[PDB]
């Protein structure tokens, strides 16, 4: 059922993806690379004292604080959902091999018994109503670009000046490029305007993953992560194999002379993709105004900040169901891309812009190095983009694509299983829009708070409440999938956007509280995804600009966890045993140094200003800007702090671009 074409790096089709510069050529050729991360300045992830510390601490905390999760996946008591063995990885050393990305997810969806389009007219109206509500009365804003981010295919530039030029040029030439694509002239659009080509596959670490201790043997077991070989990826699973990647770290002693303590493993590696910047810039110019609309008008469902902000909504509910979606990005349906595009055309959006948007979600993928002696292959033909990868992580609107799919998927689940009396309110497009507008503002007896694949579904008192309880029971039983669209289950230890919903003896939302996840504190402090990048002079360009700052926001973020104090004492005791030093003093010194360094980057901050004007969100984001890509948004961060991490193209250039895209 159609194997995707594949081209080696030597092929002209792959060569055309990399510009005639050292950075682009190095990216094309880069072989498999691995190494210990510099966890903190002058400390490697594989340091014997650090691994001794991790062994003692993970064992102690699991022993003294076993998980408190009930039969319905509700967290209670200590606020712990699993063991603390997730920290036991040799950070910087990945599992081998990483997966080859699936060129087509059509068979994957069909075999999982998931729909190839909207099941009913009601569902079709709801998905289309979501497009009309999300993309309608948008306001232009400056196009913000992350400092130090790559432009990927074809230039691979990390320079802000070059990035601004590329983005401004892209906004000027998007119409001409989109019109060429409408004529089927993809090669011309790419050659002239660098809009097309492929996504560049980057493999990212998921630093902590499940590890269990087998009581029978006293030996640790890592969670098996299934990977697809090249044959499986190109055939969409028709041929080739899906097998467990090797997390065995024994190899590090032989290859690198690194001592590997018992029960320490190689890290899980996830595919991530970087988009061709010239294609992403015109998409981002529309995506940011869309986020501003949904986070303002539909703030109830979509805008999530603090644990108390979430708590105020959830406390009003009679029932709260914390859902889980299996492999969201790979299962994301191409028919939704086509439905979105069709509806934007119906609204009066520029056909050339819709074509660029459509193309961004069908683009080929360049596979770098999943393992030693593997990769350097382009999947799909850039002359006619036709891939069905699901949702590409580096696309300019991925968060919105996951949010649109999932928000409607959950609403449909609530309609099907709990509220058939509301079906009469969804008769046509105007009534579908009126109903969805009301639902998204939290005005109906069925409610939700969501972001992509993370959500909490609510029921107030009323006719739907009884159905709500049956749906929860169906999820607990786990025999029937409640959705025709995605694989839905209940979360084992309900949480929403990093905050655990802590229930009491009553097991009711009214008396439940949102608390920080203590395991996330440990993940962030002892298993960061990236090293400190001490060689990158401009700190704002680093993946972890100011790691020391997270100590100042720790109490605000995690202080509400029942075992907060216990964990900090256990850390201090174990760090003393391992290093013969105070961890608290070590972090206080790092906090002082990073606070001083920060003033160099903030115009409003004098030579030794201090953190007085900064919020806990500001501090968490300066230590980890990745939180700005999955947890928070621009409006949640102080203006002077957002400027440290991002730079923009003028609103004058974006305003003119947006006028040409949008309906009359
Ligand atoms: Mg899952
Ligand atoms: Mg959830």
From Swiss-Prot:
Binding site for Mg(2+): 453, 490, 494
The protein's required cofactors: Mg(2+); Mn(2+)
Compartment(s) of residence: Virion
GO molecular function terms listed in the Swiss-Prot or TrEMBL record: metal ion binding; nucleotide binding; RNA binding; RNA uridylyltransferase activity; RNA-directed RNA polymerase activity
EC number: 2.7.7.48
Name of the top EC class for this enzyme: transferase
Chief place of localization: virion
GO cellular component: virion component
UniProt xrefs under InterPro entries: Cystovir_RNA-dir_pol, Cystovir_RNA-dir_pol_N, DNA/RNA_pol_sf, RNA-dir_pol_C, RNA-dir_Rpol_cat_phage
Subunit composition and interactions: Part of the packaging complex composed of RDRP, P4 and P7. Interacts with P7.
UniProt protein name: RNA-directed RNA polymerase
Name of the gene encoding the protein in the UniProt record: P2
């Amino acid at each position: 059922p159609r194997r995707a074409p594949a081209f080696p790096l030597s092929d002209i089709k792959a060569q055309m993806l990399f510009a005639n510069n050292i950075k682009a050529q190095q990216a094309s050729k880069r072989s498999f690379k691995e190494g210990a991360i510099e966890t903190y300045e002058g400390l490697l992830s594989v340091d014997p004292r650090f691994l001794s510390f991790k062994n003692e601490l993970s064992r102690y905390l699991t022993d003294h604080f076993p998980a408190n999760v009930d039969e319905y996946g509700r967290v209670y008591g200590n606020g712990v959902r699993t063991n603390f063995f997730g920290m036991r990885h040799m950070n910087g050393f990945p599992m081998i091999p990483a997966t080859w990305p699936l060129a087509s997810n059509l068979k994957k969806r069909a075999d999982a018994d998931l729909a190839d389009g909207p099941v009913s007219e009601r569902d079709n109206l709801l998905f289309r109503a979501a497009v009309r509500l999300m993309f309608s009365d948008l306001e232009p804003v400056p196009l913000k670009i992350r400092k130090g981010s790559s432009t990927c295919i074809p230039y691979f530039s990390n320079d802000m000046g070059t990035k601004i030029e590329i983005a401004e040029r892209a906004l000027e030439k998007a119409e001409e490029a989109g019109n060429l694509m409408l004529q089927g002239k993809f090669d011309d659009a790419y050659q002239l305007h660098q809009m097309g080509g492929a996504y560049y596959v980057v493999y990212r670490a998921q630093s902590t993953d499940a590890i269990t201790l087998d009581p029978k043997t006293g030996k640790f077991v890592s969670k098996d992560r299934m990977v697809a070989d090249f044959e499986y990826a190109v055939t969409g699973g028709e041929q080739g194999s899906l097998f467990a990647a090797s997390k065995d770290a024994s190899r590090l002693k032989e290859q690198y002379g690194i001592d590997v303590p018992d029960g320490f493993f190689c890290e899980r590696r996830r595919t991530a993709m970087g988009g061709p910047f010239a294609l992403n810039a015109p998409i981002m110019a529309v995506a940011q105004p869309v986020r501003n609309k949904i986070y303002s008008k539909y703030a109830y469902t979509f805008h999530h900040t603090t644990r108390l902000n979430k708590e105020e909504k959830v406390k009003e509910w009679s029932l709260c169901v914390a859902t889980d979606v299996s492999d969201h990005d790979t299962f994301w349906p191409g028919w939704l891309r086509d439905l979105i595009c069709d509806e934007l055309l119906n609204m009066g959006y520029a056909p050339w812009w819709v074509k660029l948007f459509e193309t961004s979600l069908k683009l080929p993928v360049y596979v770098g190095a999943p393992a030693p002696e593997q990769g350097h292959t382009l999947l799909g033909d850039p002359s006619n983009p036709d891939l069905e990868v699901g949702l590409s992580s580096g696309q300019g609107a991925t968060d919105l694509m996951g949010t649109l799919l999932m928000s409607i998927t959950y609403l449909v689940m609530q309609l099907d299983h709990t509220a058939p009396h509301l079906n009469s309110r969804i008769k046509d497009m105007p009534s579908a829009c009126r109903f969805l507008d009301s639902y998204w503002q939290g005005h109906e007896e069925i409610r939700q708070i969501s972001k992509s694949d993370d959500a909490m579904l609510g029921w107030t008192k009323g006719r739907a409440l009884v159905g709500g309880h049956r749906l929860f029971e169906m999820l607990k039983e786990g025999k029937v999938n409640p959705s025709p669209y995605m694989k839905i289950s209940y979360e084992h230890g309900g949480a929403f956007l990093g905050d655990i919903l802590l229930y009491d003896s009553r097991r009711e939302p009214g008396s439940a509280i949102f608390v920080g996840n203590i395991n996330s504190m440990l993940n962030n402090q002892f298993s960061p995804e990236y090293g400190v990048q001490s060689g990158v002079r401009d700190r704002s360009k680093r993946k972890r600009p100011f790691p020391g700052l997270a100590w100042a926001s720790m109490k605000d973020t995690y202080g509400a966890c029942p075992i907060y104090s216990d964990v900090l004492e256990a850390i201090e005791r174990c760090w003393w045993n391992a290093f013969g030093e105070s961890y608290r003093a070590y972090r206080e010194d790092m906090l002082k140094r990073d606070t001083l360094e920060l003033s160099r980057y903030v115009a409003s901050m004098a030579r030794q200003a201090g953190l007085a004007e900064l919020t806990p969100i500001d501090l968490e984001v300066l230590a980890d800007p990745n939180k700005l890509q999955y947890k928070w948004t621009q409006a949640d961060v102080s203006a002077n702090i957002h400027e440290v991490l991002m730079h923009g193209v003028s609103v004058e250039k974006t305003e003119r671009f947006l006028r040409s895209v949008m309906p009359r």
